[PDB]
Design a protein around this ligand. Sequence first.
Ligand SMILES: NC(=O)c1ccc[n+]([C@@H]2O[C@H](COP(=O)([O-])OP(=O)(O)OC[C@H]3O[C@@H](n4cnc5c(N)ncnc54)[C@H](OP(=O)(O)O)[C@@H]3O)[C@@H](O)[C@H]2O)c1
Ligand SMILES: Nc1nc(=O)c2nc(CNc3ccc(C(=O)N[C@@H](CCC(=O)O)C(=O)O)cc3)cnc2[nH]1
Ligand SMILES: [Mn+2]
Ligand SMILES: [Mn+2]
Length: 159
Amino acid sequence: MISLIAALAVDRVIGMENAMPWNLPADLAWFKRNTLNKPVIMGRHTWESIGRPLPGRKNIILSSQPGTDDRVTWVKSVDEAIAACGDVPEIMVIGGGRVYEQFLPKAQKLYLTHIDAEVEGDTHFPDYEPDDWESVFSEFHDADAQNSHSYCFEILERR
Ligand SMILES: NC(=O)c1ccc[n+]([C@@H]2O[C@H](COP(=O)([O-])OP(=O)(O)OC[C@H]3O[C@@H](n4cnc5c(N)ncnc54)[C@H](OP(=O)(O)O)[C@@H]3O)[C@@H](O)[C@H]2O)c1
Ligand SMILES: Nc1nc(=O)c2nc(CNc3ccc(C(=O)N[C@@H](CCC(=O)O)C(=O)O)cc3)cnc2[nH]1
Ligand SMILES: [Mn+2]
Ligand SMILES: [Mn+2]
């Protein structure tokens, strides 16, 4: 199955200047828990934003140009990215905006974090059709001394 995972601020903002404009330790822990031991597909700008390979995961980077780092796998099309994952139960697509748009029609599950933060951004999660999706899990958390915003973890499944 293909799944997307993302953290969204207000108005579906996901990034600004090739970075994320918040620091939510609890959300990165959720990201790690839901991606470890799975392949992760990302676009080249997200690869540069993370800045290093993610441990315990097969890292697959989409770019139209040849690769520049043999610690990760480089592919040149969506279909090649999927194939490079081979025969696993669940493929995690970890962004960014352009990559999420291309994989959304192919996805069966969304792992969304809704963050109560107002930030200017330059990248948005796609504007998906809510009627297509069933919420199967939601868990709200208030802000605390480690996490400066409230946030809600949600899992949706395609109906
Ligand atoms: N909040 C979140 O959960 C989250 C998650 C991930 C990323 N982000 C943010 O998202 C932003 C980056 O997103 P973005 O939309 O600018 O970029 P992106 O989707 O990460 O990367 C786009 C690049 O991927 C390559 N690519 C995409 N589709 C391709 C295809 N079909 N075939 C070949 N190459 C393909 C191209 O690289 P080439 O130009 O080399 O061809 C393209 O320029 C950053 O701000 C980052 O912090 C946020
Ligand atoms: N829910 C969610 N939150 C995010 O912040 C997120 N970020 C990306 C892409 N950017 C990043 C940036 C950093 C790390 C990162 O350093 N992760 C470590 C955290 C380890 C920990 O908290 O102990 C990792 O091992 O996954 C992951 C993805 C994609 N989907 C997301 N999805
Ligand atoms: Mn806030
Ligand atoms: Mn919902």
